[PDB]
């Protein structure tokens, strides 16, 4: 046998393969690519930024309540990349846990506590053969109190890790390697500077070339205690500067 | 049905014919002179290389007869 374990069960249910790691788990990372969404997140010292498509496909779909930037809670917000069905499901579960934490535990929620908490849950889903390793990936922004602005991304596999720069989506590998060159030729991060880096990476990689109504940018700022979308006004001012950049 | 990666065999009389069939649909030779009326029981079995929208243009589903349709058949 070749071309998947069809005489075997290993992509049918969750159990380790003869090769070590599961077919199914690897396959979950392939479900992200289906969403059509690519997110680029850039970590700064002024804000931690997310740039994602506002993009609507008709007159019939809202854009006054359809967004992939989500306010988990005031300080910490996130973007979901991949399957839309799984996307909402994690957001609500995250929202309830965030209120419950704040109420009982009394601690303000950094980037790590939401990220790590979801990640452990998404391990249980991967571990059960009833549930499936997630169809979405969550990239969080939020201000860590000791570190400063932080960008984390948690895997549908159930791993969390910190990132100075990250990308998730259809072109996961292409955008991260592109952004790697930008880190290497380092930018002293101002407000405008983190936002600029994120949009140039995504514009080159998709090769659409975005304008301000087509993207929506999410910041969690050090003077904003709440999560805010920058919308078109600030984006256009940066956008022109991008053409003049290089 | 081309999902091949088949590290062991996988026939491939069938592979050659699957590729040749695409070639004839492509406009190296006309496709305005040859039309294809294709009948297959499922599209689940079939691979997207074949289906497309410039190999098979219309996708017409056939549901099982309605109530009025069976009276007409009789």
């Amino acid at each position: 046998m070749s071309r998947g374990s069809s005489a075997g069960f290993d992509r049918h249910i969750t159990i380790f393969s003869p090769e070590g790691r599961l077919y199914q788990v690897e396959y979950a990372f392939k479900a992200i690519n289906q969403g059509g969404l690519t997110s680029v997140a850039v970590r700064g010292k002024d804000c931690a930024v997310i740039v994602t498509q506002k993009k609507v496909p008709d007159k019939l779909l809202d854009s006054s309540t359809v967004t992939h930037l989500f306010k988990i809670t005031e300080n910490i917000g996130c973007v979901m990349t991949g399957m839309t069905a799984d996307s909402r499901s994690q957001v609500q579960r995250a929202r309830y846990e965030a209120a419950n934490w704040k109420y009982k535990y009394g601690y303000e929620i950094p980037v790590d506590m939401l990220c790590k908490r979801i990640a452990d849950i998404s391990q249980v889903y991967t571990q059960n053969a009833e549930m499936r390793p997630l169809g979405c990936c969550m990239i969080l922004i939020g201000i860590d109190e000791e570190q400063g602005p932080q960008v984390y991304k948690c895997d549908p596999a159930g791993y969390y890790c910190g990132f100075k720069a990250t990308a998730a989506g259809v072109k996961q590998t292409e955008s991260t390697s592109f952004l790697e060159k930008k880190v290497k030729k380092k930018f002293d991060w101002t407000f405008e500077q983190t936002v600029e880096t994120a949009i140039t990476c995504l514009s080159t990689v998709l090769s659409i070339d975005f304008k301000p109504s087509e993207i929506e940018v999410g910041v969690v700022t050090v003077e904003n205690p709440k999560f805010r979308i920058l919308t078109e006004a600030e984006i256009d001012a940066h956008l022109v500067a991008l053409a003049e950049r290089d | 049905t081309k999902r091949f990666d088949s590290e062991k065999a996988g026939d491939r009389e069938v592979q050659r014919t699957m590729l040749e069939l695409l070639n004839q649909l492509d406009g190296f030779q006309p496709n305005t002179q040859v039309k294809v009326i294709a009948a297959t029981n499922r599209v689940d079995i079939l691979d997207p290389a074949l289906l497309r929208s410039g190999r098979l243009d219309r996708k017409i589903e056939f549901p099982m007869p309605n109530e009025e349709a069976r009276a007409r058949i009789m």
Binding site: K71, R95, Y96, A99, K102, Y103 | -
Partner: protein
């Protein structure tokens, strides 16, 4: 305990709050702040014993927090005052906690509520509360009128709290006054070097 009051403003609310909650001689809370929020839509002023108010205060905070983030546009205030009702229905022969809720929601527009320790919820113009902060009956009636002017409302609230702290024992120390508009709460702190002192009761 604390003199808490809220009088209905232009289309929003003006608040007043004291700063001590006393259990007889021993101060349960030497410092009490009843100006802080419990969501950005609703604020409440909490009266009665220290433990009875605090437990109610943390649940309405949790439920309210989940509701604004889950919905996507914030919830309304009418929800906040019902959450407090539920709790009191259980505790209506044991505890009591007399919460008077006011702010403004954006979505349906301004609200002033009183949720009681027996469980009820009803709309009022101005309610002032606590056990020994019921001694301003004349003062609240003469001061509140239907759509009172914002400048008048500010003076009347500070003035009513003063009459309280002097006359009732339970009250005392820094009056925390808050004037609220549609999305913003602005607090001023009025000295406890200032108090108007009661005139010839002997």
């Amino acid at each position: 305990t604390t003199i808490m009051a809220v009088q209905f403003d232009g289309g929003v609310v003006l608040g007043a709050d004291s700063r001590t909650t006393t259990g007889s001689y021993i101060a349960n809370r030497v410092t009490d702040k009843l100006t802080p929020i419990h969501d950005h839509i609703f604020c409440c002023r909490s009266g009665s014993a220290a433990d009875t108010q605090a437990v109610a205060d943390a649940v309405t905070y949790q439920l309210g927090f989940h509701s604004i983030e889950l919905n996507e546009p914030p919830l309304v205030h009418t929800a906040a005052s019902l959450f407090k009702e539920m709790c009191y229905r259980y505790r209506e022969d044991l505890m009591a906690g007399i919460i008077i809720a006011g702010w403004d929601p954006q979505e349906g527009g301004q609200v002033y509520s009183v949720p009681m320790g027996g469980m009820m919820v009803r709309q009022s113009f101005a309610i002032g509360g606590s056990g020994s902060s019921y001694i301003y009956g004349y003062v609240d009636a003469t001061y509140r009128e239907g759509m009172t002017k914002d400048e008048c409302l500010q003076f009347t609230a500070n003035a009513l709290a003063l009459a309280m702290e002097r006359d009732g024992s339970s009250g005392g120390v820094i009056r925390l006054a808050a004037i609220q508009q549609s999305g913003v709460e602005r607090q001023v702190l009025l000295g406890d070097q200032i108090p108007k002192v009661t005139i010839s009761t002997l």
